[PDB]
């Protein structure tokens, strides 16, 4: 009734994208066949935000699956919720993008993009009132990063008055040794600053450190990293999918979260942090959730929030608990750390409560923060980029696909401009 079209791109995009559909499909009681078997009408009231209905009261994700190689899409197709996705919404090439932004954005990806738009268009046309698009992808490879940003540009051309949202996985050398990731990610960030409204920065640095240091997993796998992504995605989309007042559509979230059009990069956090499988036996009290969701160690972006100031925050508490105690605790964090919240945006913290908890938990909290400390993320990428770029290293892979050095220089500059704007507001004062 206010529909969202979801797109997932590349290996990473499709991996987390699949996990997201598994998790939410279960929260809304949909099963692999696409049949509702839940026991609550809360589950269905806003089901049309993410699912189309079908013959036999069937629910079908409004989800387009994109990759330049077939590999992962056969892994999607024959995973648990593989059957649920609409088969003509699988759009795949044959060659792959070889971790190369330029191929995904300018050569190999441009061949495929028209067919993805045809599928987007067919999905946009059956929509009573389309709100926008959410894209899942990594920024360190070639398809999700290069082709993903190409798509975004093209969708905004056809739907310039719809909201664009991404969950963008930021690369880290603690997780990948592919040497051109900083290039691919600086080029993507350039696109993102210009053409999205909200971006969830999901930093592989942070997910790895959480797995290792806090969940005591000595050999984290992508499965462990993605469990954290899917929990966060479940949490940050709760207000869109369940009945509610605050940030209940993409536009309203954006208005609440983005004071300046370029500063739309969000830090998500989650409490309690869990590892897959192992159960959690104690429920958290509302104070523990509050203290934890705001903890640096619970952030999915590896930035220290005490190094910045929060422009805006949204908090979402899930489960059966006292709204009185939540308001009190929410108020106590701000009044006890008020200097970390910009005083020139009054009442910048907003709080929602959904009665349905996530599977496996009695109580949970998701935090979405637009903080100036995210600049640490962009500096880090920028340092890694510069170390290579100043010797023009690895550039032949990009110039061989038509690109000029100028395009790298513009991108580095735009990301350095972004970083300094965060700084500007960090320092501001009334």
């Amino acid at each position: 009734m206010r529909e969202i079209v979801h797109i997932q791109a590349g290996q990473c995009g499709n991996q987390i994208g699949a996990k997201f559909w598994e998790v939410i499909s279960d929260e809304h009681g949909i099963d692999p066949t696409g049949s509702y078997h839940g026991d609550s009408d809360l589950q269905l009231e806003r089901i049309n935000v993410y699912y189309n209905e079908a013959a036999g009261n069937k629910y079908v994700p409004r989800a387009i699956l994109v990759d330049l190689e077939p590999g992962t899409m056969d892994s999607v197709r024959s995973g648990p919720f593989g059957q649920i996705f609409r088969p003509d919404n699988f759009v795949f090439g044959q060659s792959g993008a070889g971790n190369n932004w330029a191929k995904g954005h300018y050569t190999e990806g441009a061949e495929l993009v028209d067919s993805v738009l045809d599928v987007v268009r067919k999905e946009s046309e059956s929509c009573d009132c389309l709100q926008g698009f959410q894209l899942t992808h990594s920024l360190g490879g070639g398809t999700g990063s290069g082709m993903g940003t190409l798509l975004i540009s093209k969708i905004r051309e056809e739907y310039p008055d719809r909201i664009m949202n991404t969950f963008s996985v930021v690369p880290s050398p603690k997780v990948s040794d592919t040497v051109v990731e900083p290039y691919n990610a600086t080029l993507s960030v350039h696109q993102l600053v210009e053409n999205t409204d909200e971006t969830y920065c999901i930093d592989n640095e942070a997910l790895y450190d959480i797995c290792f240091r806090t969940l005591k997993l000595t050999t984290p796998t992508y499965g462990d990293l993605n469990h954290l992504v899917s929990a966060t995605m479940s949490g940050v989309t709760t207000c869109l999918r369940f009945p509610g007042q605050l940030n209940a559509d993409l536009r309203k979230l954006a208005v609440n979260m983005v004071p300046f059009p370029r500063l739309h990069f969000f830090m998500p956090g989650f409490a309690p942090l869990t590892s897959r499988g192992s159960q959690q036996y104690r429920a958290l009290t509302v104070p523990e959730l509050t203290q934890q969701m705001f903890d640096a160690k619970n952030m999915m972006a590896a930035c220290d929030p005490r190094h910045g100031r929060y422009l805006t925050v949204a908090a979402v508490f899930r489960g059966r608990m006292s709204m009185k105690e939540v308001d009190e605790q929410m108020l106590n964090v701000q009044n006890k750390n008020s200097s970390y919240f910009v005083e020139w945006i009054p009442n910048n913290v907003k709080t929602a409560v959904c009665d349905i908890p996530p599977r496996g938990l009695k109580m949970s909290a998701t935090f979405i923060g637009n903080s100036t400390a995210i600049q640490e993320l962009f500096k880090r990428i920028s340092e890694q980029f510069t170390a290579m770029f100043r010797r023009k290293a690895f550039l032949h892979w990009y110039t061989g696909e038509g690109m000029d050095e100028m395009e790298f220089t513009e991108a580095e500059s735009n990301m350095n401009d972004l970083v300094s704007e965060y700084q500007q507001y960090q320092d501001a004062t009334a």
């Binding site: 208005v255 300046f260 308001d327 020139w344 009054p346 910048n348």
Partner: protein, 439 residues
Amino acid sequence: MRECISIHVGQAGVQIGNACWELYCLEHGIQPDGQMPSDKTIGGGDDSFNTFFSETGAGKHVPRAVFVDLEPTVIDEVRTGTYRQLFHPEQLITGKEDAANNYARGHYTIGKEIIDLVLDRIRKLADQCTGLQGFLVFHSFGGGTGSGFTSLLMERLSVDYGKKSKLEFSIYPAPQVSTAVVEPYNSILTTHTTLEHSDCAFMVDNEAIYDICRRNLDIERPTYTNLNRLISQIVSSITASLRFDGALNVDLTEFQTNLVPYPRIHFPLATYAPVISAEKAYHEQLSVAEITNACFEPANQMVKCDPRHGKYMACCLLYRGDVVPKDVNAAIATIKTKRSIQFVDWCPTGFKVGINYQPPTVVPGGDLAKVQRAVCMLSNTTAIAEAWARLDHKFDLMYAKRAFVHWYVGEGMEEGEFSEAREDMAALEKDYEEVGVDS
């Protein structure tokens, strides 16, 4: 008998309208289906309640009401709820997508594509009216629709109904239940734009109401339903003289005369007592003196502010229940000696009193206890400017950095509309200070 049309705009306006017409129906013994056993002129008449209801040959009483929202969820609840039959489908107008908490989107962008339709549905009510006096408009200051579309609508009713009166019921934004950080921006924008078009406006600060609910109804965390039931009693109290026989405030014109000598200063403070929880086992019934005296407690006001530090230009007391003038006069005598009540020099120090013998009606299973006697004081006091001050300060903080402004520019509004709206409020706070303070 002259008719009145109620326009309810955006979620807050609609939900509060819902609450008011439920109460109006219980007060005049009108049932959910619209039938009124006590009404003996079947198919028409010019009784006092007909100011708010029109009649059909089938014996059916229907609100002189129009609900408008730019999204449909909330007006759908009206369409399928207990009072579904009361209203005609043409009175309930909805859009597809809402103003997203943005005045500009509600004024300029979505306003355009729906204003003409709404004016037309209003005109269909005004043509069942032998002698329309004007409109009561209900909205939030902070919503996109509530602020942006209402101000556009107000501009248009001035044009298509120039000689008609317009009263507002306006919800002033409170962080404890607000849904947008831009509520200050919208609130100033819509105030600037609506000020010349409004004759008398009754503000209700959600903060005041929310606390009255915690403090006096023992509600751990008030919902809109709690808030709105309380608000609807105040409104009902205010409108009672239009819907019942009496000689005070019998028409919209009289509200302006009795409450608003200086036109821009048209924001009377409402104070209400007593508010008593229905769960309270033992309640000692409050006297006339006691509830009158409670009218000068800030804790009972619709807006928290301190009238001791301003001046009055007018004051009405509206009593419901077992009350006689003798008691009111004695209560006012003791209260004058005990309290700080300074009128402006160019006004008589007095009170206009209205007694309606029927005690307040409460919604069954509501949170409010039935009481023998209640009162609602309406006072035009410069103390209310404190609410303007608060809202302006917050606007200043944000606008100094241009935070969020791009969202408004992006809908076609010019930045300079911000400073112009803010200049108009600066002058407003100036007018309240000239009137209210000396040295």
